[PDB]
Design a protein around this ligand. Structure first.
Ligand SMILES: CCCCCCCCCCCCCCCCCC(=O)OC[C@H](COP(=O)([O-])OCC(O)COP(=O)([O-])OC[C@@H](COC(=O)CCCCCCCCCCCCCCCCC)OC(=O)CCCCCCCCCCCCCCCCC)OC(=O)CCCCCCCCCCCCCCCCC
Ligand SMILES: CCCCCCCCCCCCCCCCC[C@@H](O)O[C@H](CO[C@H](O)CCCCCCCCCCCCCCC)COP(=O)(O)OCC[N+](C)(C)C
Ligand SMILES: CCCCCCCCCCCCCCCCC[C@@H](O)O[C@H](CO[C@H](O)CCCCCCCCCCCCCCC)COP(=O)(O)OCC[N+](C)(C)C
Ligand SMILES: CCCCCCCC/C=C\CCCCCCCC(=O)OC[C@H](COP(=O)(O)OCCN)OC(=O)CCCCCCC/C=C\CCCCCCCC
Ligand SMILES: CCCCCCCC/C=C\CCCCCCCC(=O)O[C@H](COC(=O)CCCCCCC/C=C/CCCCCCCC)COP(=O)(O)OCCN
Ligand SMILES: CCCCCCCC/C=C\CCCCCCCC(=O)O[C@H](COC(=O)CCCCCCC/C=C/CCCCCCCC)COP(=O)(O)OCCN
Lengths: 303, 347, 126, 83, 113, 97, 105, 114, 99, 70
């Protein structure tokens, strides 16, 4: 029943990102003293269905002069990576139990920029190419600090295994052990997904949008597992699943709140932010988190 | 560039060479070659112009290909024997690959094509460094694995280098290309004796380095890069031209000068191994190098070429910076033949 | 012969990008070849080294290559018999870099710092 | 001492991120050499048995080597439990 | 200003203390698990040796049956000059068995997730 | 065996492609990187097969140095383009033998 | 050429990584530890020429352990003969080699 | 060169210990405490001879010692042991720390019996 | 083989969904009617590459902490991080992080 | 009012409930009512292989207790 497990992982993610659009519109409306969609469906519950049907029934505007190869390749890679990032996640058991799960997520995340590069190159426009280049530069810049923060945090875990993070946070959350790294990790996840205040940029467009929102939910779930560890009882995993889902939802709503609250950066401003505030602090905290377990004789077990 | 950065880069070049020279692990030798190549590129490009950039990219491509094949030879040697120590090569295919990679690193024929262009593109100081210091590491590696070289391939490449240097030097009016072809011929002479005696290789390398340093410093002092520009030096400093003429006579292998010591010794060593035809051809071919050295001497000091009026102003000024060790280099490159038996110091 | 199949594909991708057509397409061919090679290493048992290929090589170096381009115009027998205990030997050997390979760390760090300096000096221009 | 204090006060304003970075880095460099628990961490690493303990052939000249695990001879881990 | 930094340092120290205690307990638990493995190891070694010897003997009997008519063959000849025992390779134990168990013994651990 | 042969064959193909030089110096850099990837795969397979634990650092080291070289090469390429407007190999003919 | 700075100073800059049988972490042995140890002990202090001439047995055994060419050749011969016999129709596999056996712990 | 000597299939016959990994893990500590002598003889022989064929008798001895240990456990402390190893068998990691309670019972029982 | 099947399923579903998206609206009848090369972006990419190499060096730290040579390992890890910080400082001071 | 956002969020929650729970149940269904055995480090892989050989039905999760020791 491995195919059933794979499908039961894939389909609910797609439905969740389908209804996250309605949740985002409703939350933004209510924070804007108005209402979100409440006409199509009893409370807007049919709105995602309507948008999906309209998008799938509308004419696709092929450039008629661009390279069809990369044009069709880019959304495939985007959605495939977005769906693949979910398989090692423990909630509380992963679909695929990996020794180096965290490194696997990092590698796929590094892959994710190829869709941006190829869609920009195949758009057959100089301005879209410039926008794609700017997006790629921002993404690689922030994934550097993502990697360093991730290794610093895992220094208290003992391995790259994602399930061990449940054992590490059995009594206390990792947020209490390292909140500054958590703050920079949250901001770097915001800048990785091109979310406000970093949003500086019909069918294929729907696929790209679906991949983006799946990446948002996946990043929030990874953050919840990494920093707010839920207690897991081996004889009732539903409790862990409920806690993990609630924390993921809270983090996603925080993303929407941040989008609704702030102006957006300039390009040079976010590049300066990273390279001159996050990188020095991240390096200093990486030194601190290397030295701390040795100083206090609190090295984690596995090797 | 900034003098601090320039000093750091030069020290990095020397440290890469020394890492090659002191390590017993193949990976560390490869790392030393990589460090040397990385630090060498800015030194060539120090004076920014399209010619220097072109020379730097040519040199980079050549050295990167050579280093890639060196890594391949190391991996094949490890595959056929779980060894990392630099010793006997344990495999003929790996040893052929290593020999070819080191030959392209040195610029031996038929991998000689990059040397004249790189030397012409870069300035005289970069050319001095490239033609003197950049030969130590590959030659040291070749000396360490001399007992495994196939003598046929080594001797073929050495004889080809001597012939190519002699023939290519005849056609040159640019002094840097003349130096490059001379370097190719001297590399051929150095590598023709590796299978029989590495002490002879080291002695030839020392004599060649002394002579090349002296000639490059003389060319820097009289800031000339062409034959006609060098033909004006007698009207400002005839002493420099006379010293350069004696140095050129030494570089041609004429006794009783210093440049006769290597060939003589090498010939003797080859004769001790029942090799007669090859040293004969080698001396016959070195006659060509001597011919174009003599042509330079004719145009430089033995005759007086026409001058220009604006030379008179140059009569009123003296060189502000004097290169130390230039007199010592001239003396060592001209008058050390009576001290030949000192080679037993295993120089 | 799963390993053999991967090897054949690896060579086919190399022939594809070695013809050097349209450097963007040569880069795509090299990306496919690198993926197949990482798969070979993973199927052999080198999980960390294969993931290192997949992360460093593919996501940094080929990404920078594509960025720069966009700016411009038989088996199973030779295997072991026993087990590795309660750890993975590849991870232990790789982690021995900080306890055994002090010299390697020193020379590599110096080379990387020199590389940063060299890149800045070369791209300065003037 | 006045110039250094003035520099620190001027850096704490208009540049707090760099001050925090240098402070944390320096503390991470300095503290491990002064802590007494680094020896405890080394000892804990030593006491983790990854390999099988191969027994030694008894010749009647090894009183420090126990003949059974429960024998009082050999290293103890009471200190680790008390930690 | 001061109070915010004090609160942050306080929560950092509390987390450090809690993690120190928990990690020391985890080290003790890992030592206990390793000791259980060490206690179980000799029986596993004996069983492994018996199984390897049985497989080698079965392969030897089958080789004797198959290579009877080959003129220059010698049954159970070594490829080494030394008489020291050599640990067999995977192809030596499963060379004559079915593909399913060959692929099991080769890729089961690698493919298990 | 066969697997080793394929890896070597890939290295030889990449070296031949580098030495072909149709145009587009970027293709030369890509050939160099393919050669290094082949070397990485081959060395990793050898080191893992023989259980040479301490040699497990060796692939990583190689990779790092190679990528550094790659960066260097890229910089050179860019400068050449900034002089000619293209990375064409035939434009590097100012210096001749 | 080679300047043995390590031997002069007793530094051990890179000698720890030169052979399989040299102090691996956690005492993890190489696959061919015994053959390499025997070959090294045979060839020690004798020189490359005499080592190549006189320690050929140990080096041959070490190479056989490393690449297993003779073993694969023998296995291939046995498998080919079995395939020919089963194609002809005189030999049949036992239940042990057909998956019908009784496994042991 | 030479013929590889292998023992006959009769030399490799012994009454196997037919319990799974959870049962072995549950009793691993007492098994190590009680069956130390044959196990250490076998391991010393194994590391000294470096030959599987030279250590068969000690292997049969360690199998016999394990069988005797498990027979004593069966005759004395059946049900608490069953609960303990069911505990251990449930977990995907077979952790000792989940149900120490059952362990205590088992320990108490053996301390009263053997 | 489980990861192979999972990747195959993900890629198959992505391809099928994108193909139906691109081909469903193509059955009905409708009308059916440079130079600059910024240096700064190249510098950002190269800095990313070098910093990623240093991250590749720093990656084995979670395993490096169980060696019994804790002082040497700590010294070498701090050396790597200090040289990484020095690279950042050199790029910062020579105006390599400007726009 | 604001609780009108609650329905859609609930739907999202339900979707995010499905994978994890499903995995657990499947793991319990294909591993004999127990947790799926995890095997890193290759020693517990040997334990699982030995369990498979001991069960007699080629299934590792079929546990053989003391009643099988005779
Ligand atoms: C035998 C084998 C030998 C093979 C060949 C020998 C290698 C020769 C090249 C070495 C350096 C190049 C050089 O000196 O110029 C050629 C030189 C001619 O001088 P020049 O042409 O007037 O100088 C032009 C410079 O390029 C103008 O550049 P600059 O003005 O920027 O110079 C800055 C200067 C001043 O450096 C400083 O500012 C010092 C500050 C310290 C920096 C701290 C950094 C630490 C991190 O530093 C140097 O000149 C480089 C010294 C490197 C240190 C080596 C140890 O000729 C020789 O040096 C012949 C050397 C004889 C052989 C070596 C000794 C005999 C054995
Ligand atoms: C033009 C003539 C050449 C001039 C050369 C430059 C002169 C200035 C150099 C100043 C002296 C440098 C010597 C360094 C001091 C100590 C050296 C010592 O530590 O090293 C010894 C080595 O000492 C040197 O080799 C001796 C150098 C003496 C050079 C003189 C020979 C010149 C040939 C004859 C021409 C006459 C020249 C006389 C006027 C200068 C041990 O060597 P070893 O590590 O165990 O083996 C490695 C070398 N192998 C591989 C070849 C065996
Ligand atoms: C002797 C001459 C000194 C002056 C000349 C220096 C020449 C250039 C500098 C390069 C020299 C490097 C010196 C260090 C050699 C490494 C070996 C030594 O340090 O021992 C190590 C000890 O480690 C030391 O702590 C290393 C500290 C050195 C690093 C700090 C500064 C490095 C700067 C070097 C220059 C690089 C650029 C300069 C940056 C400022 C090994 O530790 P140990 O555990 O016993 O053995 C490991 C094997 N085990 C596992 C079986 C036990
Ligand atoms: C795309 C993703 C590539 C990598 C996917 C698998 C990553 C991984 O680590 O899983 C390996 C997995 C689990 O190993 P461990 O985690 O170490 O634990 C098992 C021991 N207890 O085991 C395996 O090696 C099986 C997978 C190897 C074969 C397939 C590898 C992928 C091959 C892809 C080739 C096609 C690439 C095309 C180009 C790609 C460009 C984007
Ligand atoms: C003895 C023990 C020592 C312990 C060592 C640790 C001590 C800790 C000292 C304080 C560390 C705190 C650092 C936390 C992160 C600091 C980064 C930072 O300050 O960057 C800011 C900027 O950072 C930002 O403002 C980014 C915010 C972007 C808006 C996005 C919304 C963020 C607000 C919502 C709250 C997020 C909560 C995260 C929770 C995460 C939960 C997982 C600097 O920018 P400038 O003001 O322009 O000044 C520099 C230019 N000259
Ligand atoms: C010795 C420990 C070292 C290891 C820790 C290092 C961790 C990482 C930190 C290094 C990262 C790179 C740092 C690069 C430094 C660049 C400095 C610089 O040039 O910035 C100046 C500005 O900063 C400066 O003025 C220079 C440095 C100022 C001093 C910084 C702190 C110095 C030491 C203070 C802390 C000392 C110890 C703290 C103890 C407190 C008690 C615990 C220019 O900034 P602009 O972007 O141009 O903007 C200016 C226009 N608005």
């Amino acid at each position: 029943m491995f195919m059933i497990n794979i499908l039961s992982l894939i389909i609910p993610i797609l439905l969740a990102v389908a209804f996250l659009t309605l949740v985002e519109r409703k939350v933004l409306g209510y924070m804007q003293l108005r209402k979100g969609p409440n006409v199509v469906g009893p409370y807007g519950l049919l709105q995602p269905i309507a948008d999906a049907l309209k998008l799938f029934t509308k004419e696709p505007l092929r450039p008629a002069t661009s390279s069809i190869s990369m044009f069709i390749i880019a959304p495939i890679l985007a959605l495939s990576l977005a769906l693949t990032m979910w398989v090692p996640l423990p909630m509380p058991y992963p679909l695929i139990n990996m020794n180096l799960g965290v490194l696997f997520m990092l590698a796929m995340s590094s892959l994710a920029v190829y869709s941006i590069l190829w869609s920009g190159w195949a758009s057959n426009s100089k301005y879209a190419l410039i926008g794609a280049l700017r997006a790629v530069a921002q993404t690689i810049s922030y994934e550097v600090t993502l990697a360093i923060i991730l290794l610093s945090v895992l220094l208290m875990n003992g391995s790259y295994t994602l399930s061990t993070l449940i054992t590490t946070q059995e009594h206390i959350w990792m947020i209490f052990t390292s909140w500054p790294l958590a703050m920079m990790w949250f901001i770097s996840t915001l800048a990785e997904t091109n979310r406000a205040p970093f949003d500086l940029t019909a069918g294929p467009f729907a696929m790209f949008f679906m991949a983006e929102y799946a990446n948002i939910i996946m990043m929030n779930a990874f953050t919840a597992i990494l920093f707010l560890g839920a207690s897991h009882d081996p004889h009732t995993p539903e409790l862990y699943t409920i806690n993990f889902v609630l924390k993921t939802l809270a983090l996603t709503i925080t993303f929407l709140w941040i989008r609704a609250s702030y102006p957006r950066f300039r390009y040079d401003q976010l590049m300066h932010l990273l390279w001159k505030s996050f990188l020095p602090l991240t390096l200093a905290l990486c030194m601190w988190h290397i030295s701390l377990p040795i100083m206090t004789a609190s090295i984690p077990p596995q090797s | 560039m900034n003098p601090i950065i320039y000093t750091t880069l030069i020290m990095t070049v020397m440290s890469g060479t020394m890492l090659v020279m002191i390590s017993s692990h193949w990976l560390l030798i490869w790392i030393g070659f990589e460090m040397n190549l990385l630090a060498m590129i800015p030194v060539l490009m120090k004076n920014f112009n399209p010619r220097a950039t072109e020379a730097a990219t040519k040199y980079f491509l050549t050295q990167a290909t050579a280093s890639m094949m060196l890594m391949m030879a190391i991996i094949i040697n490890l595959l056929y024997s779980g060894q990392w120590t630099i010793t006997k090569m344990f495999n003929p295919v790996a040893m052929t690959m290593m020999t070819m990679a080191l030959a392209m690193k040195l610029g031996l024929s038929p991998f000689h094509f990059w040397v004249p262009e790189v030397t012409q593109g870069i300035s005289l100081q970069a050319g001095l460094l490239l033609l003197t210091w950049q030969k130590l590491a590959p030659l040291s590696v070749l000396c360490q694995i001399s007992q495994s070289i196939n003598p046929n391939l080594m001797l073929t490449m050495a004889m080809l280098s001597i012939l190519i240097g002699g023939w290519g030097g005849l056609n040159q009016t640019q002094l840097r290309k003349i130096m490059a072809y001379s370097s190719i011929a001297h590399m051929g002479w150095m590598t023709a004796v590796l299978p029989y005696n590495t002490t002879m290789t080291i002695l030839n390398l020392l004599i060649y380095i002394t002579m090349t340093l002296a000639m490059f410093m003389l060319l820097i002092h009289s800031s000339a890069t062409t034959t006609l520009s060098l033909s004006h030096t007698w009207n400002k400093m005839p002493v420099i031209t006379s010293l350069m003429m004696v140095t050129l006579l030494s570089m041609g292998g004429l006794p009783p000068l210093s440049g006769f010591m290597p060939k003589w010794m090498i010939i003797q060593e080859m004769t001790k191994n029942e090799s007669i035809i090859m040293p004969t051809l080698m001396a016959m071919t070195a006659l060509l190098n001597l011919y174009f050295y003599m042509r330079l001497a004719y145009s430089s000091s033995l005759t007086m070429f026409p001058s220009t009026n604006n030379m008179k102003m140059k009569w009123q000024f003296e060189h502000t910076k004097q290169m130390k060790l230039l007199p010592t280099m001239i003396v060592l490159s001209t008058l050390v033949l009576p001290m030949t038996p000192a080679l037993s110091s295993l120089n | 012969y799963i390993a053999f199949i991967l090897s054949t594909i690896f060579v086919i991708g190399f022939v594809g990008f070695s013809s050097k057509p349209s450097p963007i397409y040569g880069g795509l061919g090299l990306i496919v070849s690198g993926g197949v090679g990482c798969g070979i290493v993973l199927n052999f048992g080198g999980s960390f080294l294969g993931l290192m290929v997949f992360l460093i090589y593919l996501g940094g170096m080929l990404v920078v290559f594509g960025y720069t381009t966009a700016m411009a115009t038989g088996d199973w027998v030779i295997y072991d018999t026993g087990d590795s205990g309660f750890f993975s030997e590849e991870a232990m050997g790789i982690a021995a870099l900080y306890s055994y390979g002090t010299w390697l760390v020193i020379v590599t760090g110096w080379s990387l710092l020199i590389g940063v300096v060299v890149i800045m000096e070369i791209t300065r221009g003037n | 001492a006045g110039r250094i204090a003035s520099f620190l006060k001027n850096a704490w304003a208009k540049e707090p991120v760099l001050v925090a970075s240098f402070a944390i880095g320096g503390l991470a460099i300095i503290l491990p050499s002064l802590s007494p628990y680094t020896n405890y961490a080394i000892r804990i690493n030593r006491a983790t048995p990854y390999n099988y303990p191969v027994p030694l052939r008894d010749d009647g000249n090894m009183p420090d080597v126990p003949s059974h695990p429960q024998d009082p001879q050999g290293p103890s881990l009471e200190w680790l439990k008390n930690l | 200003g001061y109070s915010m930094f004090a609160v942050g340092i306080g929560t950092l120290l509390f987390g450090y203390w809690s993690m120190m205690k928990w990690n020391r307990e985890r080290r003790r638990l890992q030592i206990e698990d390793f000791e259980a493995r060490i206690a179980l190891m000799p029986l596993f070694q004996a069983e492994k040796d018996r199984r390897v010897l049985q497989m080698l003997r079965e392969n030897l009997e089958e080789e004797a049956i198959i290579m009877k008519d080959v003129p220059d063959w010698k049954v159970g000849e070594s490829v080494f000059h030394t008489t020291r025992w050599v640990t067999p390779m995977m192809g030596e134990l499963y060379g004559l068995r079915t593909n399913e168990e060959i692929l099991s013994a080769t890729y089961g651990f690698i493919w298990y997730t | 065996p066969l697997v080793y042969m394929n890896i070597i064959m890939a290295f030889a193909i990449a070296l031949a492609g580098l030495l072909m030089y149709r145009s587009h110096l970027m293709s030369s850099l890509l050939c160099l990187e393919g050669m290094m990837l082949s070397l990485f795969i081959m060395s990793t397979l050898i080191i893992l097969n023989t259980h040479f634990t301490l040699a497990n650092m060796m692939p990583i080291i190689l990779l790092v140095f190679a990528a550094c070289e790659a960066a260097l090469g890229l910089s050179l390429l860019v400068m050449v383009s900034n002089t000619y407007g293209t990375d064409y190999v035939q434009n590097l003919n100012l210096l001749q033998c | 050429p080679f300047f043995d700075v390590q031997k002069r100073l007793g530094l051990d800059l890179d000698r720890w990584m030169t052979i399989q049988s040299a102090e691996q972490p956690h005492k993890i042995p190489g696959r061919c530890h015994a053959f390499e140890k025997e070959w090294i002990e045979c060839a020690h202090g004798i020189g490359g020429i005499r080592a190549e001439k006189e320690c050929k047995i140990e080096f041959d055994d070490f190479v056989e352990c490393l690449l297993r060419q003779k073993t694969m050749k023998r296995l291939s011969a046995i498998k080919r003969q079995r395939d020919k016999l089963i194609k002809e129709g005189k030999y049949t596999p036992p239940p042990h080699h057909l998956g019908k056996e009784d496994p042991r712990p | 060169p030479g013929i590889v000597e292998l023992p006959t299939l009769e030399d490799l016959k012994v009454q196997e210990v037919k319990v799974s990994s959870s049962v072995l893990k549950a009793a691993a500590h007492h098994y190590g405490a009680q069956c130390d002598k044959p196990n250490k003889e076998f391991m010393l022989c194994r590391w000294e001879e470096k030959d599987p064929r030279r250590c068969l008798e000690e292997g049969k001895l360690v199998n016999q010692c394990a069988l005797d240990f498990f027979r004593q456990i069966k005759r004395h402390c059946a049900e608490p042991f069953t609960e303990y190893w069911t505990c251990i068998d449930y977990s995907g990691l077979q952790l000792f720390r989940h149900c120490r309670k059952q362990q205590a019972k088992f320990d108490e029982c053996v301390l009263d019996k053997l | 083989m489980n990861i192979m099947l999972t990747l195959l399923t993900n890629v198959t579903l992505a391809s099928l969904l994108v193909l139906i998206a691109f081909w469903l609206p193509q059955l009905n009848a409708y009308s059916e009617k440079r130079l600059p090369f910024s240096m700064k972006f190249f510098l950002v990419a190269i800095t990313f590459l070098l910093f990623d190499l240093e991250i590749a060096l720093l990656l084995p730290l979670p395993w490096a902490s169980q060696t019994n040579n804790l002082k040497t390992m700590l010294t070498m890890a701090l050396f790597l991080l200090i040289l990484l910080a020095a690279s950042l400082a050199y790029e910062w001071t020579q105006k390599g992080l400007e726009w | 009012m604001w609780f009108e956002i609650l329905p859609g969020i609930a739907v999202m929650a339900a979707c995010l409930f499905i994978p994890g729970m499903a995995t657990a149940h499947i793991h319990k269904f294909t591993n004999g009512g127990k947790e799926k055995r995890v095997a890193h480090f290759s020693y517990q892989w040997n334990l699982m292989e030995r369990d498979r050989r001991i069960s007699g039905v080629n299934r590792y999760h079929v546990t053989k207790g003391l009643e099988n020791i005779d």
